[PDB]
Amino acid sequence: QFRALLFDVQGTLTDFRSTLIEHGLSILGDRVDRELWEELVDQWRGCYRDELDSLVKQEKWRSVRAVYRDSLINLLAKFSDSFCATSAEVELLTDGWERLRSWPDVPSGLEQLRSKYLVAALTNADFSAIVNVGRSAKLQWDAVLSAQLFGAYKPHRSTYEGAATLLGIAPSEILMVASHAYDLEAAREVGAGTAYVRRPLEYGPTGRTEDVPDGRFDFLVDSISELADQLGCPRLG
Amino acid sequence: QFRALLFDVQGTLTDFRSTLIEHGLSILGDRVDRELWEELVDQWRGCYRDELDSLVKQEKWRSVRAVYRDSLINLLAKFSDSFCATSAEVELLTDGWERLRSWPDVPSGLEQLRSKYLVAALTNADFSAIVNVGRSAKLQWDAVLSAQLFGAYKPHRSTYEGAATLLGIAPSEILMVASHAYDLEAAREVGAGTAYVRRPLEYGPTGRTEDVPDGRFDFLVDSISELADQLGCPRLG
Fold first, then answer.
1. Closest residue to B127, CB basis, from A126, A127, A166
2. Where are the alpha helices (DSSP H) in B95-204?
3. Which key words are in the record (chains A, B) (predicted)?
4. What superfamily does domain A16-98 belong to in CATH?
């Protein structure tokens, strides 16, 4: 049925929240309290989402590193009374988004899938960032794809379709894999299969994630290994 | 000194000649003699080269799969007194260029290199072709880059510079690895380092060799593992 599996990375395969909390607290130390920082991280992601949403609607693309950097700068102003940072520290903090760690099932799951399928990333993050995340999150791919290559972010159709063209396959031959429903709904619009991965801790132990019922998407799993098992991929030794 | 290595793939890492000889004989069987099929493969590589040379001069890009397919159709007409092939066999033979096997040093050389460097493919072949060749040749990349992403073949500057900016890396921090002098001299012009890999059997025992003496390029080696050793990579037991 499918020839390739295309993956969202931030959240779906990576624990961004934990990564940035600890990264930040290591750059900043006692200048900041964990609870303020965690709240900042939560707002930083929100800012990212809002800016991308605006950009998508305006049919524009910009460096995601810049999006992240500029949102941190704005947030630092909001929180100026509590702590401060240098421009050099801004660059270091922003780097955390390129040092994402993976959820425990990811490396092995992805490897299991490769017995039967090509695996590729389709990310909104810039090409350089995904290459970097490969090392921090231990992801091995057949291909790496980014919005930067198409000049458009997901959910735009061009992304998914462009990936297909690049991979020499029809969109119907792609299974999109994501823990964000908007991504899967846009993939289904171009004919792809959809696989939702539940990440209950994506937004922290007290966070609220999307509740997805059985039947909305083709697959509904709690780990990439589980998805590989449901697609009939043999197990690793 | 370097953050990443960018590699030519066909010939540099892959024994395309042996691949397409055994692949064609596997498909055509006894309908063609081995020595005739070998001469066809050499002319087929020659047609690809002349065609790309022509397109580079015209600032044009076209699918490399269609380049191999059309030139094979032409060669079949010239050899049509001797053997024949169906339209389905044309497509199966052309697939040979997406099933390239690697030289024996290559899979473990690439692995040793990854301990200190990012490694990426920069190929004239279509994106899907290099993705398929990763399975047949056993190549694992941090990134795969193709002339198809840039609309231009190597040696155009825009391919190396495009690779550099997508990776977010200064060209002076990229080492280009190739067994073809034209490729390394082109990379040198954009500021990259150069590593020449001698492949005495690329065009078979009686082939057109360009001799490179020492000092023409930054590195001159006989295997990717030797290159890894010269870059100070630990050997992996």
1. A166
2. 106-113, 127-137, 147-150, 157-167, 181-189
3. Hydrolase
4. Putative phosphatase; domain 2 (1.10.150.240)
Q: Where are the domains of chain B?
A: 4-15+100-230, 16-98
Q: What is the rounded end-to-end Cα distance, in angstroms, of chain A?
A: 25
Cα nearest neighbour of B117 on chain A: A135
How were these coordinates obtained?
X-ray
Query: CA B158 to CA A59: how far, in whole Å?
Result: 25
Question: Rounded to an integer, what is the distance from CA B8 to the centroid of its chain?
Answer: 5
Contact flag B118-A131 (C-beta cutoff 8 Å)? yes
Per the structure block, which two tokens stand in for A223? 């780990």
- Which of B61, B123, B128 to mutate against chain A (most A CBs within 10 Å)? B128
Q: A120: helix, coil or strand?
A: strand
Check if the beta carbon of residue B5 is closer than 8 Å to that of residue B119.
yes
CA distance A78 to chain B (A): 30
In contact, A41 and A20? CB cutoff 8 Å:
yes
Label each residue of A172-220 as H, E or C: HHEEEEECCHHHHHHHHHCCCEEEEECCCCCCCCCCCCCCCCCCCCCEE
* Architecture of the domain spanning B4-15+100-230: 3-Layer(aba) Sandwich (3.40)
CB contacts of B117 in chain A (<8 Å) are none
Check B142 against A142: CB less than 8 A apart.
Answer: no
Q: Cβ–Cβ of A135/B142 closer than 8 Å? A: yes
Which residues does chain B have within 8 Å of residue A148's beta carbon, measured at their own beta carbons?
166
Amino acid at B52: L
Residues 6+ apart with CB under 8 A from B57: none
The DSSP-derived string for B158-181 is HHHHHHHHHHT--GGGEEEEES-H
Set of chain B residues whose Cβ sits within 8 Å of the Cβ of A118: 131
Round to whole Å and give the CA distance between B162 and B178.
18
CA dist B215 to A112, A217, B110, B212, B232, Å?
45, 59, 24, 8, 19
Q: Which of B134, B148, B149 sits opposite A142 (nearest CB)?
A: B134
Chain A residues near residue B167 by CB distance under 8 angstroms: 127-128, 131
Does the beta-carbon distance from A142 to B135 stay under 8 Å? yes
Which residues face B58 on adjacent strands?
A: none
Tell me the three state secondary structure of residue B107.
helix
Say how far residue B56 (Cα) sits from the centre of its chain. 17
d(CA B144, nearest CA chain A) in Å: 6
Q: Between A134, A149, A168, which is nearest B149 by CB? A: A149
- Cβ distance B131 to A143 less than 8 Å, yes or no, reads yes
